[PDB]
Amino acid sequence: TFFTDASQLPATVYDFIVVGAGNAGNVVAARLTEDWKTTVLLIEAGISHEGIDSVAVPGLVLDNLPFSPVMWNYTTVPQAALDNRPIPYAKGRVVGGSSSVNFMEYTRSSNTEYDRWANLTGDAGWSWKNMEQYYLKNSRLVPPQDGHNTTGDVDPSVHGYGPVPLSLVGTPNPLDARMRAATQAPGAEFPFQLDMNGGDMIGFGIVQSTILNGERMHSGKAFLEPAMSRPNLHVLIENTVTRLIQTKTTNGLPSFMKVEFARDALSARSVVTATKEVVLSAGSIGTPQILMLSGIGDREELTAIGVNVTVDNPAVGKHLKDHPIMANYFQVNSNETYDDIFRDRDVSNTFLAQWKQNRTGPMVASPSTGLGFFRLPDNDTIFERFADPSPGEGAGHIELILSNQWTPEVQIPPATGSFLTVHAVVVSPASEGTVRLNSTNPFEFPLLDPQLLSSEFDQHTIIHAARLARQFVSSSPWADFVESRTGIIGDTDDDEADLLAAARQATVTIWHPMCTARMAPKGSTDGAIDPDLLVKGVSGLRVIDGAALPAIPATHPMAAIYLLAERGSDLIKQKWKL
Ligand SMILES: Cc1cc2nc3c(=O)[nH]c(=O)nc-3n(C[C@H](O)[C@H](O)[C@H](O)COP(=O)(O)OP(=O)(O)OC[C@H]3O[C@@H](n4cnc5c(N)ncnc54)[C@H](O)[C@@H]3O)c2cc1C
Ligand SMILES: COc1ccc(C(=O)O)cc1
């Protein structure tokens, strides 16, 4: 159990205040309290994860979308490159944050991802050489729930000892064997990847999910729950941080050591104080919104909104990156898909009962079976006009995600039939957008503009990815299984203009907003924070979450965020000699 009101807290002063009990924030709160002395208050806007089946049970993940108590739901402004469609945005609003509601897929990214962080920041502490220790500390490989033989599908030698457990799936599907046969063959057009967490992601690999004993092990399970028996950790839920309040100058810079919060817009505000640091872990949307409302951000833009600006930090809310996705649906000559589970609540409930009984069956599966990462050819024409937006070697421009059902996105499954989805993702997008305030009201929705598919690079690449999906399933292991294409993209012929017009209607965000208070070198205004994660122009304020990353990962970002939080935690311990 958690505190739900300020009046319950044992103190109003703490060594550290961490805002956001999410993917990163729970890492920070748990790591910092490991000495059993350092006091931390963790403040979270959302509800407890406890007792919620749609969080604990992997197979129920789609039930939280598009709208549920555990999810923050909003939409983008009209997206100019997507036929002016406003696109749904979701993020977690629960203990564990987005790790409690996400699709559980853990991919640390290529070695070159971390090397790129080093190059962008000028700080070799973010290089893979130095980051490998934080990967091994974060996660470990565990056996599949069903004890099936994973030989050839994972490499135990590239996994560590940490609290986040990764497993291959504990219930079978018809995709894995076809994926292996299509990709492991001599001369396969799409190669096989033994272990995408071993430094090179290129090829199709069997997904590795944050699931142990058939249960989702989100950051609230891996980090927070174990740490909550400590006397020096206190967790306040159901309270939104409204702004930071400026306190005394420290080292010649303004500090913001007071944290104001409230249960809701009509509730009386309370204030707590940190004596060492405030850490913002409110995510790529929440963290810039707090900074802006605190008067830390673009002076001109914030003044126009009526914020009293205290630190001109123009990168705040800029450089928003996200991954566009569009589904390629195929009807399949199979009765082994999960479509009946999605469509029929009685079916779902019966498999839920099996899960509650002995943690087996379809409910232990994540929403994907396999992930494939591919590069455009080096000698490809588009790189005349575009620099490589990827980390380089071992990272893709494109991801193809295999799902053993019609994954709902823009469209939901037809009432009849069995489906495969091959999702086309641009994992190295060139498009960039913003998060801005609408209002000085802290409870008002932000203005979200990812500029999805605005770059011609992203348009070209997502269309190319749709063609790759169709080519992937044309090989002989897929010949008896895939029967035809359907849905927006699938019904479209191969012509580029036709596919682009379809992409403008089928594309959505995968919900990986990133880089809105990003690291940059000291003296650069290309980012909001320094390479040590401390906010530029401020003393005592650190950002540890998706907002901090200087580039969007070329893959599912939960793991890179975990690793950033692992190192950030150590940077705090080092500075304060904990
Ligand atoms: C549906 C979905 C599926 C996804 N699937 C995957 C996948 O399979 N694999 C993967 O790698 N990534 C996936 N992602 C992305 C990944 O989950 C996120 O990029 C990552 O978890 C974000 O980490 P974070 O710590 O930056 O933010 P979050 O985990 O979102 O944490 C932010 C926390 O701060 C809280 N908060 C925000 N504002 C305030 C405030 N003002 N006051 C107090 N608290 C506040 C939030 O409620 C939340 O708990 C998915 C995302 C979603 C939404
Ligand atoms: C349908 O499969 C997936 C899996 C992961 C993600 C994601 O990382 O958001 C999206 C779709």
Author numbering: 2 to 579
According to the publication:
AAOs are flavin adenine dinucleotide (FAD)-containing proteins capable of catalyzing the oxidative dehydrogenation of nonphenolic and phenolic aryl alcohols, heterocyclic alcohols, as well as polyunsaturated aliphatic alcohols, into their corresponding aldehydes. The active site of AAOs is enclosed from the outer environment by an insertion that creates a loop over the active-site channel. In the reductive-half reaction, the alcohol is two-electron oxidized in a concerted reaction involving a hydride transfer to the flavin N5 atom and the abstraction of a proton by the catalytic base His502 assisted by His546, resulting in flavin reduction. In addition to this well-characterized oxidase activity of AAOs, a simultaneous quinone-reductase activity has been reported recently in PeAAO and its homologous enzymes from P. ostreatus and Bjerkandera adusta, as well as in Ustilago maydis AAO.
The crystal structure of BaAAO in complex with 4-methoxybenzoic acid was solved at a resolution of 1.8 Å in the space group P212121. The asymmetric unit contains the protein molecule, one FAD molecule, one 4-methoxybenzoic acid, six sulfate ions, five glycerol molecules, and 377 water molecules. As a member of the GMC oxidoreductase superfamily, BaAAO complex structure contains two domains: a highly conserved FAD-binding domain and a substrate-binding domain with 4-methoxybenzoic acid placement. In the comparison of PeAAO and BaAAO complex structures, an RMSD of 1.35 Å for 558 Cα highlights their overall folding similarity. Regarding the substrate binding site, in the BaAAO complex, the carboxylic O atoms of the 4-methoxybenzoic acid are H bonded to the Nε atom of His513 (the catalytic base in PeAAO), the Nδ atom of His557 (the other highly conserved His residue in GMC oxidoreductase superfamily), and the N5 atom of the FAD isoalloxazine ring. Comparable interactions are also observed in the mentioned PeAAO complex. Thus, BaAAO substrate-like binding mode is compatible with alcohol oxidation by hydride transfer mechanism assisted by a catalytic base as previously described in other GMC proteins. Furthermore, Phe104, Trp512 and atoms of FAD create a hydrophobic environment for stabilization of some carbons of this product analogue. Notably, one of the strands in BaAAO is twice as long, (comprising residues 325–333) compared to PeAAO (319–322). This elongated strand in BaAAO includes the Tyr330 residue, whose hydroxyl group is bound to the oxygen atoms of the Gln412 and Thr408 residues (detail 2). Notably, the substrate channel in BaAAO appears wider partially attributed to the presence of the Thr498 residue in its structure, rather than the Phe397 residue observed in PeAAO, which leaves more space for the substrate to access.
